[PDB]
Amino acid sequence: RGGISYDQLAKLSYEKTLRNLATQTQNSSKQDKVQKDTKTGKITIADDDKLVNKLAVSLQSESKKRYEARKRQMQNAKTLYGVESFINDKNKQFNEKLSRES
RNA sequence: ACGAAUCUCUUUGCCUUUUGGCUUAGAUCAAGUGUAGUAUCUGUUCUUUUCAUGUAACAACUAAUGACCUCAGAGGCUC
Numbered sequence: 001r002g003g004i005s006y007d008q009l010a011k012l013s014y015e016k017t018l019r020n021l022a023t024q025t026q027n028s029s030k031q032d033k034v035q036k037d038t039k040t041g042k043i044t045i046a047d048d049d050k051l052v053n054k055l056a057v058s059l060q061s062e063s064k065k066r067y068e069a070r071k072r073q074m075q076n077a078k079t080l081y082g083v084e085s086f087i088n089d090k091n092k093q094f095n096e097k098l099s100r101e102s
Numbered sequence: 103a104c105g106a107a108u109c110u111c112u113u114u115g116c117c118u119u120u121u122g123g124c125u126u127a128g129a130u131c132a133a134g135u136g137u138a139g140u141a142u143c144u145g146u147u148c149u150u151u152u153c154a155u156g157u158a159a160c161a162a163c164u165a166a167u168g169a170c171c172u173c174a175g176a177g178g179c180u181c
Contacts, residue, residue, distance in 0.1 A: 001114080026106060027107065096120075
């Protein structure tokens with residue numbers, strides 16, 4: 001049991017997004033360079049604007065999905081426990097935090 | 103009882119609005135009246151300071167506005 005370290009958590013997050021990129025290519029397949037300017041020193045990479053848009057969309061979708069999966073957790077945990085005496089929400093979140101200690 | 107994806111749900115992981123010093127626990131757990139000072143309101147006294155009927159005849163007012171012309175705003179004329 002126990003917790004998962006950050007180097008093991010990062011690999012599992014990297015393994016998970018590779019399966020999201022695998023099925024994204026499978027759902028697409030189901031439906032149907034390097035230039036180095038010598039004067040400036042800058043390196044320009046030419047890439048597809050669709051794959052850059054799909055990168056920007058999927059990060060926003062994962063940002064909203066974790067935002068909504070946490071918002072429902074806020075609305076559920078506020079309306080679970082009311083037995084022990086509280087005063088405000090920061091007291092409830094602290095007295096619940098004492099319960100996970102024991 | 104192994105779905106390639108979405109939603110809903112359960113359990114672990116994450117705690118994600120999840121107690122921000124000090125010292126003699128920092129110190130104490132007590133009725134009315136009397137006096138002094140400031141402020142407000144009322145009363146009295148003293149002083150100072152703010153003005154000047156009717157009729158007839160004559161004169162002024164209802165300076166400003168509009169327009170035209172000359173000179174480089176003023177001058178003249180009419181309404």
